[PDB]
Amino acid sequence: AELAKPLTLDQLQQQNGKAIDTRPSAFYNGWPQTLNGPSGHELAALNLSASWLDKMSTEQLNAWIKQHNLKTDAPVALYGNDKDVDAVKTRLQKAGLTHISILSDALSEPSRLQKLPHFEQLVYPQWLHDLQQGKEVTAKPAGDWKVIEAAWGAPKLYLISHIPGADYIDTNEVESEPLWNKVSDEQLKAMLAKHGIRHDTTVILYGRDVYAAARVAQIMLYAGVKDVRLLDGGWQTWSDAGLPVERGTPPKVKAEPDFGVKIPAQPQLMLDMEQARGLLHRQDASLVSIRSWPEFIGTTSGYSYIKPKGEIAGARWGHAGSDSTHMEDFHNPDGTMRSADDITAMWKAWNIKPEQQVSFYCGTGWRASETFMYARAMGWKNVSVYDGGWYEWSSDPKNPVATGERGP
């Protein structure tokens, strides 16, 4: 049951092996474990956090092994803390892998590590707690910062428990009837003022569901908030970390009546219907459906208030989740963002590529916003959300619709 012979990264490469980073994804993504410490993962490494194992069945681990092209007998070299490495070793042995070593020089050359181009946009619980406690942290906000819980409607779960010092935003403050598109620039200006946000205020959003926070975030980026971040995995990661909480009604926030730039500062982050239409049938652009497969093939609209079924003709499938309110294809077993390499591969399979102008949509914009935030953190330079989505598109029967089982 012991590890095979240790391998350096160069040895591993010359033997066509794979490295596996057993740390939580925050560190894999680039967050250092200590200030000014190593940032990222070894080249081409996979992330298999030991903390996920109690939420991964045999089938799920077998699926993961298959999805990552791990050959039964090819060398795998693990790194991370000793306990996590042992835990992962044991599961991989029981899964059938026959050549499991330690990566002997792992993290010893900080210069050779790989990270998310903007990992600092996807924060994690300890970081936020340390920030709140006045400690020095990596990628600290330049100045003022706010933490905000986002959800639909008046505060519910927030009243019972929330992150200390967090404000609350009802998603109905940023979008409305009749199409569930974002509110006007003037209404956004009012919302920003009321929640004490200037263009140079860092905003960290979280939700019980990530997509609620992402929706608010993407609309803030459009408006012109420069530094907008998400808590990766949302509230549940804070809860599971055992960190302190607060309760009750949202505290009074000092208003900021002057945003400091003209809204919207980043209008290119949102597309309208005609702009979205313009991305279709191209190799240098993709209009990407973040809808469940039953929605993509036209079995269900995904929404009680959307009668038309089908998909935008020419739209490429971006993956999503099991139904219209889930996003499993983008999440690790702990709810955090799946590795950039894996997201990249699933998009590449549908001809969605970083050099393209890429716009994401869904029924009304929430799931598309989550993918927008991930692509932004991944360094994709030309991404947006087509706000109207299927609700708008299908409101006109003349707009071309695709239906049924089909492929790239």
From Swiss-Prot:
Enzyme class name: transferase
Gene3D superfamilies: Rhodanese-like domain
Binding residues for substrate: 367
Listed InterPro entries: Rhodanese-like_dom, Rhodanese-like_dom_sf, Thiosulphate_STrfase_CS, TST/MPST-like
Keywords: Periplasm, Repeat, Signal, Transferase
GO molecular function: sulfurtransferase activity; thiosulfate-cyanide sulfurtransferase activity
EC number: 2.8.1.1
Recorded catalytic activity of this chain's protein: thiosulfate + hydrogen cyanide = thiocyanate + sulfite + 2 H(+)
UniProt KW Signal keyword: yes
Primary localization: periplasm
Coiled coil region boundaries: none
Record text on subunit structure and interactions: Monomer.
The protein's name in its UniProt record: Thiosulfate sulfurtransferase YnjE
